[PDB]
Design a protein around this ligand. Structure first.
Ligand SMILES: [Zn+2]
Ligand SMILES: [Zn+2]
Lengths: 385, 60
DNA sequence: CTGCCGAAGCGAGCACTACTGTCACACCTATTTTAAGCCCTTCAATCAAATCATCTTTTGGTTAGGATA
């Protein structure tokens, strides 16, 4: 049955149907209310539990099959005064010395060698994006009723890798993490992508630099498809969209290329609940016909009242890797906007130029072409990352 | 089977067979007149000559 | 009280490589000696592809040579 298990330790899991998995999760939670989106009561010190005692002791007695006095005794025993070694007025910026923790000892070792004038700072720890996009959306609610997450809705964590891979490291990957709902279709995920592959442009305009093409790649081609468990999900909402998967099925199935039989289907025909997908196992998405993306279902879980309940942000970005700007070779500090080939002035081919370093170098006051070269408008993937 | 663009072989390796034969027969003539072939199996010599040709037409 | 001969349907001849009873002679290997070439293993000396350490080229941020707004 749909019983998640590790195919490999902490790397990937077995395949299961998302809808059946969500139904199983709800069946173990429906009626209990632990999957609800309403704020429940929270634990407190025994000196203030009197107000909540009336509402809590009876339920505790019912669930634990103990007496009301036994429930009160358990509540008094399990009070936070027995656990709160830290008072509520203590700042987290200083290590409490009255401790026996090895973890805090290692923390002290880390902090002591970062207090010198050369080392003391409040800079980034190891990354910044995750908390910034968590606190910006965690615990919030939408301004419109139609943008309400359904109670018990599945939350799927999807990692989309960039087209610019390091091709020098293999442990870590360049990717951005998108959160999607089970009921959502793949169309809303595809339309939410802001990859630079949608912004690609071209054309040789060394003679007339001001005649750059009017239409970006997104305005000329709209082909995009997902690929899960051997199924292609190709967009066809627009005439610019083409079923790219037919060429792949023609090429691959004609020979033993190392992959099995595939099937073709439209992009809007399936929701995230209809997928039978693995977790952690990479999958394929493609758009523009040459921009492939690695798709990893990192995590899946039911919605929680403390999560982002605002659907206007969904698909919600939570994590993102960084790409560095491609800067021109003239001033070696400004991000390039043009690329040239066969350039007599440039020391190397290809050479990257910024608008400032491009126009006045390759043209005079009247804009007349100088020297021999070919020029193309350039969009930096490291900028629009 | 290097004279055909079979799917099992990349097209990078396909060459005109005429130049192939010319290069190979002159290579084996070189081998013959240098006493290499006498008293030995010819087949490996022919294979080696086809090798030197096949690398010579595209060392790139 | 027994017996002859017709009617219709059958048929013919022409159109300038499986075993067995023997039998002797093949098959078979006892070793010698070269002269250049042999197949396979099997390790050792040399090599070159890939990986680690460190100098250095450049991409975000701090400093005090350097500046407007
Ligand atoms: Zn892309
Ligand atoms: Zn410039």
């Amino acid at each position: 049955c749909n019983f998640p298990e590790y195919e490999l330790p902490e790397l990937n899991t077995r395949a299961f149907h998302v809808g059946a998995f969500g139904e199983l999760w709800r069946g173990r939670l429906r009626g209990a209310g632990d999957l609800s989106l309403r704020e429940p009561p929270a634990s407190a010190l025994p000196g203030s539990q009197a107000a909540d005692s009336d509402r809590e002791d009876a339920a505790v007695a019912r669930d634990l099959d103990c007496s009301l006095e036994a429930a009160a005794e358990l509540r008094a025993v399990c009070g936070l005064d027995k656990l709160k070694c830290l008072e509520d007025g203590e700042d987290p910026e200083v290590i409490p010395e009255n401790t026996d923790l090895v973890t805090l000892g290692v923390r002290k070792r880390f902090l002591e060698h970062r207090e010198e004038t050369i080392t003391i700072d409040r800079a980034c720890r190891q990354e910044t994006f995750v908390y910034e996009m968590e606190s910006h959306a965690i615990g919030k609610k939408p301004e419109n009723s139609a943008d309400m997450i359904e109670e018990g809705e599945l939350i799927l964590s999807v990692n989309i890798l960039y087209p610019v891979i390091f091709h020098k490291h293999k442990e870590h990957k360049p990717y951005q993490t998108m959160l999607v709902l089970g009921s959502q279709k793949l169309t809303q995920l595809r339309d939410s992508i802001r990859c630079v592959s949608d912004l690609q442009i071209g054309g040789e305009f060394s003679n007339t630099p001001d005649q750059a093409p009017e239409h970006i790649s997104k305005d000329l081609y709209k082909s995009a498809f997902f690929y899960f468990e051997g199924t292609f999900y190709n967009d066809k909402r627009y005439p610019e969209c083409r079923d790219l998967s037919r060429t792949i099925i023609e090429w691959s199935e004609s020979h033993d290329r190392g992959y099995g039989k595939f099937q073709t289907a439209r992009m809007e025909d399936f929701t995230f609940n209809d997928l039978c997908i693995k977790l952690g196992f990479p999958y394929l998405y493609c758009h523009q016909g040459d921009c492939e993306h690695v798709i990893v279902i990192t995590d899946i879980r039911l919605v929680h009242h403390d999560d982002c309940l605002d659907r206007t942000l969904y698909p919600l970005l939570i994590k993102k890797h960084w790409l560095w700007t491609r800067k021109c070779f003239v001033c070696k500090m400004y991000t390039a906007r043009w690329v040239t080939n066969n350039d007599s002035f440039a020391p190397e081919d290809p050479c990257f130029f910024c608008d400032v370093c491009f126009r006045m170098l390759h043209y005079d006051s009247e804009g007349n072409k100088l020297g021999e070269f070919l020029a193309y408008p350039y969009v930096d993937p490291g900028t629009f990352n | 089977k290097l004279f055909q663009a079979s799917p099992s072989v990349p097209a990078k390796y396909v060459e005109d067979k005429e130049k192939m034969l010319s290069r190979t027969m002159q290579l084996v003539e070189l081998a013959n007149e240098t006493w290499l072939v006498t008293g030995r199996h010819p087949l490996p010599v022919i294979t080696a000559a086809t090798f030197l040709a096949w690398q010579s037409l595209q060392p790139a």
